[PDB]
């Protein structure tokens, strides 16, 4: 990986390591980006609606996985379930409930630094991975990239600002997720934000992801060409807030 400082070399340490297994997946692959430029026709607002019960930003929430999953599948373009365990309670064993009781496009939400991550999101039933510019060095992030591919998957690349996104289009994403929130501090900027989408060159799928609590930043935020938007606390601590976030 990069040289990483505090929280995120923790979790990048402790994905190294952490145990793989050998499988066979179930459902095939239900290509999310895909899913949102059908949604975008329609004029459907698109929202990547994410499972995840901590994170180091300060959520804090008890929710059912299963009835949270029904109920966004009649929404979402796609779930994000964390299946990081120490920063996100996620686990394993909650995207592999989760993917079996939707047939909605999932994104394993986690820090991707190896190939039997990889494996394990496709064999967990997950139909892409994110990746992040930020974390993993620039010929890592091409392999991994190309290593999802080489199973049916376009992983989602978060970039944060325009250096990210030189990385990520050099190494030819196509998806890509434009964080508000600073992986390492966790702080905001939507104004960096905003600069960046702008930016996105016309041929790649975007998504505004972090920092979204109401209907109308998703509106302005439209005008800007976003595809799909990812939103995750908000909706944890009230799901019927994707009422809101569609009409």
């Given at each position: 990986p990069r040289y990483l400082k505090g929280w995120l070399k923790d979790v990048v340490q402790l994905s190294l390591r952490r145990p793989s297994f050998r499988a066979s997946r179930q459902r095939p692959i239900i290509s999310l980006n895909e899913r949102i430029l059908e949604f975008n026709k329609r004029n459907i607002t698109a929202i990547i609606a994410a499972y995840k019960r901590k994170s180091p930003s300060g959520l804090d929430v008890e929710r059912d996985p299963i009835e949270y999953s029904k109920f966004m599948e009649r929404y979402a373009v796609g779930l994000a379930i964390a299946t990081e365990e120490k920063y996100f309670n996620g686990s394993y064993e909650t995207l592999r409930k989760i993917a079996s009781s939707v047939s909605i496009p999932i994104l394993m939400w986690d820090?991707?630094?190896?190939e039997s991550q990889i494996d394990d999101a496709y064999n967990l039933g997950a139909d892409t991975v994110a990746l992040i510019v930020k974390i993993l060095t620039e010929r890592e992030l091409e392999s991994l990239l190309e290593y999802a591919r080489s199973y049916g998957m376009e992983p989602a690349i978060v970039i944060n600002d325009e250096n990210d996104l030189d990385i990520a289009l050099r190494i030819g994403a196509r998806f890509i997720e434009i964080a508000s929130r600073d992986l390492e501090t966790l702080e905001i900027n939507k104004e960096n934000q905003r600069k960046l989408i702008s930016m996105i060159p016309s041929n790649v799928v975007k998504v505004a992801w972090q920092g979204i609590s109401e209907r109308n930043e998703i509106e302005e935020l439209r005008k800007?060409?976003?595809?799909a938007f990812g939103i995750g606390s908000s909706l944890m601590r009230n799901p019927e807030k994707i009422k809101e976030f569609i009409l």
């Open positions: 820090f991707i630094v190896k800007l060409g976003v595809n």
